[PDB]
């Protein structure tokens, strides 16, 4: 519906406008983990490749990505309403 189309556009727009205000790069490691229009969810194996670091570390900047996201979120609490 018009509302739904609008919402999906708005969610994607705040999602990228949120990964770059910490850093584009630790947001780049994390962005690779879920995938915006990819659905790039596996686990420990494949992650061997191009993040920039080796392999256990990304499972940490993932926590640090999610943690830095979490603090910054309480201020820009605009994503709360997308929880329906």
């Amino acid at each position: 519906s018009p509302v739904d189309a609008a919402t999906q556009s708005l969610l994607s727009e705040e999602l990228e406008k949120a990964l770059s205000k910490l850093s584009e790069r630790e947001a780049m490691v994390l962005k690779l983990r879920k995938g915006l229009i990819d659905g790039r969810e596996h686990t420990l194996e494949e992650v061997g490749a191009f993040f920039g670091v080796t392999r256990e570390r990304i499972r940490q900047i993932e926590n640090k990505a999610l943690r830095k996201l979490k603090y910054h979120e309480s201020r820009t609490r605009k994503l709360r309403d997308f929880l329906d």
Binding site: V3, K34, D84
Partner: protein, 1111 residues
């Protein structure tokens, strides 16, 4: 208060039972209370006798019985069940090849039962079967429009029980027969009957050129057998004319008392018209191996003598109510029963030619599915089976007495013309000339007249009193229209002294034609004026003063009156308002004499003389089909002495046993600052304060929890992402608590459903990961209050699977129903009406201080604009107000019968007595005439209203006798410059209320194929901007408004999505793209193998699918 009744007409008989057209018809059809051996061959019985015995083995019908209903009526309505009885039939199997006899009683399913008041319960909802008018079977003769001197004889049987026959006499001189649109010379059929040239010459011949023209030599050159084979080839091009095959076809079409049924009414009309006597209901017989004629020769005989001009031969008026008959509930149902029975017979014969010709009983041989389906089909989907109108008791009473000319065996709108819709002279006393729909259906749907009854043959009869010499007896004769035309019938109001006609000249009718006649010539006399009009029309006082077109609206709108909590009977009644409540069965009465033992809100217990203690439970706040509240209230007190037939409880819209469709309000007839404009109505806030025009309404909400391939829906209080504030009024299980105010958006029943492979998107997965909360297994599918609805929760019903007594449709675990009530105060946009067709919507509610008021301080209730009266020509409302003024001060209500009523002098007498109370009080209280009363009197004497040179009291009294009073404007205090009509009027709050009708949509549901908004308020629909609306925008040259209508506001998907996004961002809406329904058109034309190409100016194709449809 006093009830003063006018009128001198002594009505010799009371109104018949008003629902008898329903009750008597169905009782006759079922004969459940008759011991089988004593049943007459009619209804269900006649159907069985017609279908059986079933030939090859012979299956014969013994008798049927009807069981008791598995569930009572209340239970059926609750559980969405049909109220019905089990039908069984005792059948004996006989082997014609042997001697074997096996007998068993087989279960044929259920048959729906009619309740006491003449309605049905079909799947839990109350229904009415509307009677159907149609052409009576028989033999008719009409003039041939083509040849101004020749005639056509038409033999018409019962619907679906045979072909229509036409006997035109062709230009060549030979008498032709038309059957199933095929024509041939009738002489051939005559030869098949065993006729010889001698019989036709000797029988007829008297007509020089006509009888010889039927004789054709080639046809005579063959015995009756050759003529039968010869005719069959003329009818079935391609079927070999085998002698047994030809006989079978002609027998079934003409002589078979199974495939061809003239009516029982058909038999009487045929015997009577042609002066013959019929051995049965068929046009011919198969007897002693050949065919023997019954009808054809007498019909041919009558036609030739008419073509000539022989005395005793007339054309038939096909709209005459002697030639038009009613098919009542019983007959309609029995036709479908006979059809369902015949289908079952196909099954019997097919099963008797398979699986061992011996090892079969009647129980295995019979499949009742065809019978059950025919009956279930009639009650659910027939056009004559309608959802009951039970807005008020009169609604349903009127519904049951309606007469339709449409439906399965009748006209269509696309197919009905003036002759049928007309008011025939024979409608007099039988069908109401007033009560018919406005619009396309005018004249097709009508209402049974008050004193009319349908006889056993189906013709409507009306009562008349015999007049012998000049003395009027009390013996009443019910006449059909055909029989009425014989006599000279005097009007019901013709003067009488005792039983003698007291006038030298009386007003009478002969064949409907009005004629002045001497008392020596008077054969009969009308019973009453009430007999000419319907029940609704008879409820209109002073009807003789109302133009019929407005009286029509008056009738129909009483049907729409909403039951009010303070409902009152009108101060001016017609005397029918008691009978309507009693026959409606809404009100409760005492069976025998007795004493009232107990009185409760819920029940009344009566101790009779018999000693038995009878408990009458009361229906309390039950929701009718239209959501108006049917609620009964106790009218007696503990220990009250009652006689037989005394009132115990009031039903809805009844006050002490009198029909109460509205309230009696004090009305002023005068313009008021344009709030009165074009039928709008101004009302006083005092009406809401004292709860006038307040009505209770109940809405039903329902929700199912079903098994899905994704897992069970559950009705639960646990709903994802909702605050406890939102769930506050829900019980442990997720249902809203009884006695809560629910408003739009509120949860009624909580429900969860399992998420599709839509299993939350990776965008949503990452969002959910941020808040520590995992996306839940279930989504919130809860039932909520729609926009504009809500009220107090008065009841909840929960039905699960696995609870005693309940099993739902497959897959459905549980069903919850929530009943929500609302008290509706009158508001702006609600519609009011009186009984004379004055109707208007409430446009303004003024505070009591702005309302015009009498000098003594009494403010008026309603202000009606006088501009509604003169073009409409309904003056009865005016007389109603005047007599209503008298009654306000005299403390009385009146019964003024229609056409024998209160007349002007009589109303003036009452008005004078009222002025003394309105004024003499003042002179005694130590107050004299007002200054402003003098000013108005000055202006009134300039109007010729009062006599110049009289005291103010005398002049005010002169005005009061004209029903006009001095009126003060509550705003100024200054008088209205002229005397104004003020009095008591009966006004109803109709079922059309803004609360129900106000609707708006920004965006909402779209249609599957067209991607255009759905329609209707209940779907949250958009308005239709149709062809004519587009034309308006075109004529304005509003190109961008129109384009918005065609794209962004409808099916342009990219456009509607993009426009919404722009508005919430504060940008202007984007230029539209292609409407999706144009793409549908393109693809639909391709499915028809047509290549549709959008081209640019260079004639190169433009791809409006943006690459998606090309490989």
């Amino acid at each position: 208060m006093e009830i003063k009744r006018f009128g001198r007409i002594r009505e010799v008989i009371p109104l018949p039972p008003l629902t008898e057209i329903q009750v008597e018809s169905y009782r006759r059809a079922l004969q459940a209370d008759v011991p089988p051996e004593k049943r007459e061959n009619v209804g269900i019985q006649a159907a069985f006798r017609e279908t059986f015995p079933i030939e090859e083995l012979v299956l014969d019908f013994l008798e049927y019985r009807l069981g008791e209903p598995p569930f009572p009526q209340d239970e059926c309505r609750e559980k969405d069940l049909t109220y019905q009885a089990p039908l069984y039939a005792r059948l004996q199997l006989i082997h014609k090849d042997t001697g074997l006899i096996k007998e068993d009683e087989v279960f044929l399913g259920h048959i729906p039962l009619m309740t006491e008041d003449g309605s049905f319960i079909i799947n839990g909802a109350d229904r009415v079967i509307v009677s159907q008018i149609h052409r009576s079977p028989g033999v008719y003769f009409t003039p041939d429009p083509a040849r101004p001197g020749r005639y056509i004889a038409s033999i018409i049987p019962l619907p679906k029980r045979g072909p229509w026959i036409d006997l035109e006499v062709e230009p060549n001189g030979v008498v032709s027969m038309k059957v199933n649109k095929r024509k041939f010379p009738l002489v051939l059929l005559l030869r098949v009957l065993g006729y010889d040239q001698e019989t036709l010459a000797r029988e007829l011949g008297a007509y020089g050129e006509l009888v010889q023209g039927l004789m054709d030599e080639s046809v005579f050159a063959m015995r009756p057998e050759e003529a039968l084979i010869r005719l069959f080839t003329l009818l079935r091009p391609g079927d070999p004319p085998k002698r047994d095959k030809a006989v079978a076809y002609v027998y079934g079409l003409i002589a078979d008392p199974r495939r061809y049924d003239l009516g029982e009414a058909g038999r009487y009309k045929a015997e009577e018209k042609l002066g013959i006597r019929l051995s049965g209901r068929t046009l011919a017989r198969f007897e002693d191996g050949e065919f023997k004629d019954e009808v054809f020769l007498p019909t041919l005989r009558y036609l030739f003598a008419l073509t000539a001009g022989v005395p005793g031969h007339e054309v038939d008026d096909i709209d005459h109510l002697g030639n038009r008959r009613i098919r009542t509930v019983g007959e309609l149902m029995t036709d479908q029963f006979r059809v369902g029975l015949a289908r079952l017979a196909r099954g019997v014969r097919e099963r008797m030619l398979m699986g061992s010709e011996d090892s079969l009983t009647p129980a295995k041989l019979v499949n009742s599915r065809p019978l059950e389906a025919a009956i279930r089909e009639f009650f659910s989907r027939s056009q004559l089976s309608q959802f009951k109108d039970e807005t008020n008791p009169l609604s349903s009473l009127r519904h049951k007495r309606r007469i339709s000319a449409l439906g399965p065996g009748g006209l269509t709108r696309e197919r009905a013309g003036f002759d049928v819709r007309d008011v025939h002279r024979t409608h007099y006393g039988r069908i109401c000339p007033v009560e018919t729909p406005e619009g396309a259906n005018i004249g097709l749907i009508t209402s049974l007249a008050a004193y009319a009854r349908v006889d056993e043959l189906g013709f409507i009869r009306t009562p008349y009193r015999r007049v012998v010499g000049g003395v009027v007896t009390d013996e009443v004769v019910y006449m059909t229209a055909t029989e009425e035309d014989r006599y000279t019938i005097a009007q019901a109001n013709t003067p009488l002294e005792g039983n003698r006609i007291a006038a030298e000249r009386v007003v009478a009718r002969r064949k409907g034609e009005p004629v002045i006649v001497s008392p020596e010539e008077v054969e009969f006399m009308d019973v009453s004026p009430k007999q000419v009009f319907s029940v609704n029309t008879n409820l209109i006082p002073f009807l003789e003063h109302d133009d019929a077109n407005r009286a029509l609206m008056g009738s129909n709108m009483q049907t729409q009156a909403v039951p009010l909590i303070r409902a009152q009977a009108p101060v001016v009644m017609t005397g029918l308002e008691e009978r309507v409540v009693r026959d409606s069965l809404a009100a409760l009465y005492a069976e025998e004499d007795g004493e009232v033992a107990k009185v409760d809100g819920n029940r009344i217990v009566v101790r009779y003389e018999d000693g038995r203690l009878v408990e009458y439970p009361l229906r309390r706040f039950y929701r009718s089909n239209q959501g108006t509240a049917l609620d009964q209230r106790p009218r007696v007190v503990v220990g009250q002495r009652v006689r037989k037939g005394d009132l115990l409880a009031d039903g809805p819209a009844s006050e002490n046993g009198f029909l109460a469709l509205g309230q009696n309000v004090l009305v002023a007839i005068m313009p008021f600052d344009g709030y009165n404009f074009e039928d709008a109505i101004v009302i006083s806030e005092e009406l809401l304060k004292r709860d006038f025009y307040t009505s209770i309404h109940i809405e039903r909400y329902e929700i199912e929890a079903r098994d899905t391939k994704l897992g069970p829906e559950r009705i639960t209080r646990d709903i994802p992402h909702l605050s406890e504030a939102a769930l506050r009024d829900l019980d442990e299980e997720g249902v809203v608590r009884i006695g809560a105010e629910v408003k739009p958006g509120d949860i009624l029943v909580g429900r969860t459903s399992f998420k599709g492979e839509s299993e939350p998107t990776p965008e949503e997965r990452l969002l959910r990961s941020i808040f520590g909360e995992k996306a839940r297994d279930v989504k919130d599918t809860s039932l909520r209050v729609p926009p504009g609805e809500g009220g107090i929760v008065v009841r909840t019903v929960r039905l699960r699977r696995g609870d005693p007594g309940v099993e739902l449709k497959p897959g459905v675990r549980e069903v919850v129903r929530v009943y929500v009530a609302q008290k509706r105060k009158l508001q702006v946009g609600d519609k009011l009406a009186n009984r004379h067709g004055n109707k208007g919507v409430v446009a303004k509610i003024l505070p009591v201080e702005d309302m015009p008021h009498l000098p003594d301080g009494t403010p008026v209730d309603v202000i009606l604009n006088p501009l509604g009266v003169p073009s409409r020509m309904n003056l009865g409302q005016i007389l109603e107000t005047h007599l209503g003024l008298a009654g306000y001060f005299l403390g009385q209500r009146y019964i003024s019968p229609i056409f024998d009523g209160a007349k002007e002098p009589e109303i003036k007498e009452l008005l004078a007595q009222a002025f003394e109370v309105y004024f003499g009080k003042r002179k005694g209280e130590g107050f004299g005439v007002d200054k402003r009363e003098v000013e108005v009197l000055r202006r009134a004497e300039k109007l010729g209203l009062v006599t110049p040179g009289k005291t103010p009291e005398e002049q005010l009294k002169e005005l009061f006798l004209q029903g006009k009073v001095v009126l003060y404007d509550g705003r100024t205090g200054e008088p209205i410059e002229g005397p104004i009509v003020v009095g008591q009027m009966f006004i109803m709050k109709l079922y059309h209320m803004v609360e129900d009708k106000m609707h708006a949509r920004s965006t909402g549901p779209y249609s599957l194929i067209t991607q255009q908004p759905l329609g209707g308020k209940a779907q949250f629909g958009g308005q239709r901007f149709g062809e004519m609306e587009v034309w308006a925008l075109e004529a304005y040259g509003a190109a961008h408004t129109l384009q918005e209508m065609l794209t962004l506001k409808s099916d342009d998907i990219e456009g509607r999505n993009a426009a919404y996004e722009a508005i919430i961002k504060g940008e202007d809406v984007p230029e539209p793209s292609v409407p999706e329904s144009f793409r549908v058109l393109v693809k639909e034309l391709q499915a028809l193998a047509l290549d549709v190409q959008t081209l640019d100016e260079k004639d190169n194709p433009v791809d409006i699918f943006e690459g998606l449809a090309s490989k």
